[PDB]
Amino acid sequence: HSDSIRILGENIKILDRSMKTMMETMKLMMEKVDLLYASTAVGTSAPMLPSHPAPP
Amino acid sequence: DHSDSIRILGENIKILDRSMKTMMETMKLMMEKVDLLYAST
Amino acid sequence: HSDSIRILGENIKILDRSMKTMMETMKLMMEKVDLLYAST
Amino acid sequence: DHSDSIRILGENIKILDRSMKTMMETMKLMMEKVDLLYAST
Amino acid sequence: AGINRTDQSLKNPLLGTEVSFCLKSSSLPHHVRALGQIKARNLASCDYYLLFRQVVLPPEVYPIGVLIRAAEAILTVIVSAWKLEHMTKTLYSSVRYALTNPRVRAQLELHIAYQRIVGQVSYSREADIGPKRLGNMSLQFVQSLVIATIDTTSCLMTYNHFLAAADTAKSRCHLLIASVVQGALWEQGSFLDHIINLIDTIDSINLPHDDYFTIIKSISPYSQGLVMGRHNVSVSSDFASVFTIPESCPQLDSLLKKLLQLDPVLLLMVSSVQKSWYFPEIRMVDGSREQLHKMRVELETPQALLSYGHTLLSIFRAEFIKGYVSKNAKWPPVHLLPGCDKSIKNARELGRWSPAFDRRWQLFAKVVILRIADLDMDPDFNDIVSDKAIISSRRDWVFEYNAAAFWKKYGERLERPPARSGPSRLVNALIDGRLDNIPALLEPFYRGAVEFEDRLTVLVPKEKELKVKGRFFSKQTLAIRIYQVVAEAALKNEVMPYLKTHSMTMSSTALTHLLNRLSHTITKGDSFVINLDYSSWCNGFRPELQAPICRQLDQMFNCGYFFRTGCTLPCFTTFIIQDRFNPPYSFRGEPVEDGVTCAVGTKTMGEGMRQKLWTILTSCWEIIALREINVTFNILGQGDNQTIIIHKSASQNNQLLAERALGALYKHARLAGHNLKVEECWVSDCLYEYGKKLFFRGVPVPGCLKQLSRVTDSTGELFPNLYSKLACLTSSCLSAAMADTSPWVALATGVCLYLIELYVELPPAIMQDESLLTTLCLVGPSIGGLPTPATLPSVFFRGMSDPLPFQLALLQTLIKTTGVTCSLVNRVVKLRIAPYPDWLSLVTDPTSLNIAQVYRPERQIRRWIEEAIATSSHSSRIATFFQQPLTEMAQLLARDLSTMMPLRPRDMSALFALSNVAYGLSIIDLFQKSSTVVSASQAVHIEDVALESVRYKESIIQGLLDTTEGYNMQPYLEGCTYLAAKQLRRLTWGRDLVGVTMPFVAEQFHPHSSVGAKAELYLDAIIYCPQETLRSHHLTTRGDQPLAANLVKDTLVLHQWYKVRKVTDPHLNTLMARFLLEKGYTSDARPQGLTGYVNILSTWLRFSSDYLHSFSKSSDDYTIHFQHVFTYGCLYADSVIRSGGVISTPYLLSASCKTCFEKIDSEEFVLACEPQYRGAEFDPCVSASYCLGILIGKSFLVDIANLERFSISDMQKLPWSIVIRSLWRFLIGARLLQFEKAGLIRMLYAATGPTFSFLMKVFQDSALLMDCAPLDRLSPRINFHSRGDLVAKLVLLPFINPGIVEIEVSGINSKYHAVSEANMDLYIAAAKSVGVKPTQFVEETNDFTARGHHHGCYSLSWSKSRNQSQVLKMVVRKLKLCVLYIYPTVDPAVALDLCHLPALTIILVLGGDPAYYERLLEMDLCGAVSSRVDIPHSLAARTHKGFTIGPDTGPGVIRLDKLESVCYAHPCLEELEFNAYLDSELVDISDMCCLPLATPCKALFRPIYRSLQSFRLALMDNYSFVMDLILIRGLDIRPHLEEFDELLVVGQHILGQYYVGVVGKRPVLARHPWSADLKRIPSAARLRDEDCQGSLLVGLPAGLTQLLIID
């Protein structure tokens, strides 16, 4: 049953294309709030407190 | 060859595609919210 | 072909769990970003 | 019966899961970026 | 007791506040005594110059005429020991005029008196000193306070203010000495009277300190404004209207304007000196307030900053995409469904560049770049070395400021300086282990916010700057400094190469290429270069957003929040002004803001801190500004004063473009948060400062008046004594000699300052002996002498040299010229017994013997610092890395190195560097010399270093006054010192040391005119013919002539470098296998820059290597180090120019030291015992030649690279039977499209590219050419003209004809595929002496000399007349003279025929020209001119000595005159184009007739010769050329079609017998046009005819048949 494998393989290809779409939609939506994370740090006494770290 | 589970995993691929579509939908909605934010800071 | 299809089912299952967890993260992040007009 | 055709998409579904994990980490970084917004403005 | 007055010179900035704090309400007892000692009327501390103008000394207080005569003698012997002659007189006359003028001698004796007062008070146990009479003024010093008194009037000051005044007098003395020397040695006249007028002017300006010091601040900007006003008349000056210099002092403005009309370079040099003028207070009233106010200003609204930040992140992603696709050829990811350009989604898959993409900002918002690499936290230890001190953790700033100053201004004692508060050095606090782990140090930056103990910035006022408000340079905590180092290295290693703005600036070759492009464009003025100077560059950023890109840079390194802390760090950094004796108030253990001395939480991160991220931000907004207005950009930028190259746009003409571009950059950059004023940028091709160096129209200015007057910090981990000052003076002269200052100016200044420092530290008993003072300099730091500019070749030459023959030649000239005998030289030197080799050997070093000189201060820096870190650091850290002590295991290694014979330096150095003991020893070697470690290491070891200073002073007083002789040196002096230097090494080490001895240019080479040089004695020579007569202008303008896994790769380079020698020593293989296992590598068995100052002079000269008797032809290459020889010639030319003579004649180097030329002993090293460390923590020719061919192919592909990355000899030894095949394989297997092939067709027929130049460099001597089986087929086949035409028709031929390719299509290597590109050059440099090809066949041309049959008798039928090139062969065979004399008026290819004749020894009338023999050698391929024409007699001949060709008029010369008509019924030649006149009489040379000959390769032209079996296939080849060239798209085939027409006309004379176009994708040619798309475009031919014609038409294309038929 090669065709049954190939149809769902094309489905995984479409899913991979939508995954590359999602990888970039999220990276658009970084930018507009990233410059807002920037834009209001006027610095009276610097009350910043990052909470969750990141893996290497 | 075990062709009985091939249809089941293809249907599960379809469920994954449905989840991808609804995640892109909510990404579009919050993209709209964040884009309408940026005019007034 | 039993082991390959079995571990394929496990991989598709854990992908499904990962995408539903990220969907829950998206649902939380929408509630976080809807406060930005309440601030600005 | 094609074992290699199963194995290629078996590796593909895992790198797709890796892409989802990287997106989850980046979006929690976005959460920690927007966490300090509410006390700033 | 306690050490008083610890600084011999001042590095701290000046302030006059503590004087005012002492004047009112003093509490300390020495302040009270200072108030008692001063009079009623006290001048202000800022007005101290008004007291120091009145200080007059009784003239000629110090008898220093013995110093004058000694300096004359020392200059005479260093001039004669360089074996140059004319430069004695001008140097000592300049020194005499420096020491003779009454004001200069008064200033210099003031300097000597100041240094004597300091040397009596510095490192002195007594606290207060009595009244010391400096000339007329009484100075009395109590503890730290200094009281200066001229009768009634007085000034109270600090010890640092006294050091500021003493350094002002000192730097004035340096400026006056260097100005007399420079005015004697440079094109402009005497500097001296200008400085003499300006000192009295600056003490005669009737202004307060703020106004005239504001004039001092604007000395450099207003002079720059005057230069911009005079040089640019189209664009008005902008700085000329803001300052008060024309209004406040009209005489000063008149003098600056007069210097401007004489020379603006002179004005910039005089305006560029800093501390010859008096030290300002760095503007406590106004300037600190203005700088801290600009550091916290909000100039633009956040909305435009937000939008413009997206607008510049777009162009940052554009530049990073451009770099990443230009390097790795992978497109970074693109956005797909909600909004993007579909063409970019296609171009990501196709990987094609889109030119219209980069002009759009809204699409790079969509396109986001993936992670490409990972961040490596650990940096190299060679970039953490210096230039910035640290604060331990927010505690040094309390320690810095005076308790007394804060006590008077704010009434509290600051609780005093709390402690040492950590090491001031970054290195000492880093290695101690508190912040040792660099990932653990940078993890606070990974969390997103810094710790509170790290966020401090204490701003140091920069002394030695014209601007008196100045750039208060930042000083942060160790954590922020390590962040700066790691992040700058992360950009410079990875990201800056991927950015086109900074890929030029970080790569040194690309930086030089950008500087060359800028220097052409700013001087042509068609597309000139502008400069956006940013006065508030550091201050103009904003703590909310710096217009940042750090959010994307954080994702590209895969780090989290690591650069996003960089934008939030301006909120974190607390700013404190580190003006000495300045109080900022302390609130809660932390500063409080007052706006003048302090400013807490400003808008900026720091002055000079985080320069490279800010460089990308500024460059990104400027490039998106210039991309909005469609003008082509380049940027040279790294910090302040950012320079932008402007090109011509497609929108406006360059003047309208220029004004519109200035207005647009003001508007856009003003929108970016940096409020640019109208002055800070200029639309002018004038001036820019890059890399802390000033450039006027791209030419770097002479910094002699600035750098020499800049006093050295000195005393680096050393007590202040004689030797440290001499070594720092020598290193300052070296740093001048690198940075565009003449080393003869530096040497004269160094001799003057040397004898001055001697006069400070020696009694007059040594001084009254002139000959002894002459003796003292010229010994050298290797054998028992003090370091001088004279005795260090490293000042003159590059980093690596061996100075021993230079020191011994210096001593020989000292004995022969002066009255000093050998016994006096012996008692000065004290060579001593010197037994045993036990310690570490000196290889590729200054090469000290086992005797350590008694003059060098034996500071340990492997015992006391090691014991200090053993006792103090209870935590091991760097200790627990080295399990056992470093020097003990390294010394056991050196003891095992003593067992071997070859003793090779570089091999031992690299193998040592693989061990971690070298890593630790390199850390300690970094502790020996730095500018930050000195600030923590001088504070330890108190009162023993002062006793060391006194003990060394008395020790050298006893040593220089010793009598008779100390140790014998008498046999070593006379003659040469080859055997004598090897005997000194064999005496001190007990065994012969080879590989370390570099035979020096001072002995082996005597500079000469060729009339002054002898041929039969002084054999081998390097001569430097000039294109123009040089002057002092010629040192300013350029000419036409041109200029860790790495240790593992270098170890494998050494591995397959040992395969050259064909010596199989198993001990070598076992030791390097043990070191490879120490590395931990996976594969056990893995298969003319010059100094820079004389670079400008070298652009007018040429270079060669012409040493052909006994040193070049050998397999083992003799010891000549060529770059040092080239440098020596350039310095000799520079000396002749600066004396007053001109270089109008070529000057060579003469072979005197005949024994010093040593052949290398190709022998492999053997390690007797296994090293106990062991870590702690198919033939090569076929693959080498195939990879060499594909490397030539890929270099030619990337030309449309620099292939001089090899040893030149080993390719000439390598066979090229195997190169050419895979030169063709890459070009048949690439299968490029037509438009990509078009550039490769176009480029190769012109002499362009470094690849073509390197190919023409390796094709001078070629036994490789005859051996190649394609070449002995192709050279019968195609018409070969020159080296370039043969190579160009060789490499291009796989594209344009597969016919010869299909003959040799069946050959390839299977081991070719398993060879990396990092092994191929190693296999090129693995087969050099495996076979050197020592045949070197003379492919003999037409020898004549007899009667025989005609073999063709051709010579250069392609370029010149063939009858002219035969008579050069034909004269010398009738003369039967092995000698001939050739002048370079003859064409170099014509002389090649004469040089083919065997059994000659040709001694040309070169005039010593390096280029003429290099051309007629480079035309050769066979090698008859490299062997028969033996050069080191020819290169030393100026005129007629034997039978001479080339001059039109000469006594007894052979002259050639063209004859237009002659019958000449002669079987050898058809006619006689050039008649020859023998000794200026005509003799018929027709008696010479040809003979049977050997195999020829050049100048006889095999395809137009008798053979036709290759020409039949060559016809198919030329029809293949024309069927392929029409299909090539995007090319105008005029010259290649002309070469095809040459081959076709040559072919058409054999066949018995013009529209170019293609119809239906098949090229059809005839003279008549088939369709409308077709485009309209000797006696050797008789021998090329053959019998049985018709066989050429057999196996012939029908299209070729239509091509040959007319119409």
Ligand SMILES: [Zn+2]
């Ligand atoms: Zn010698």
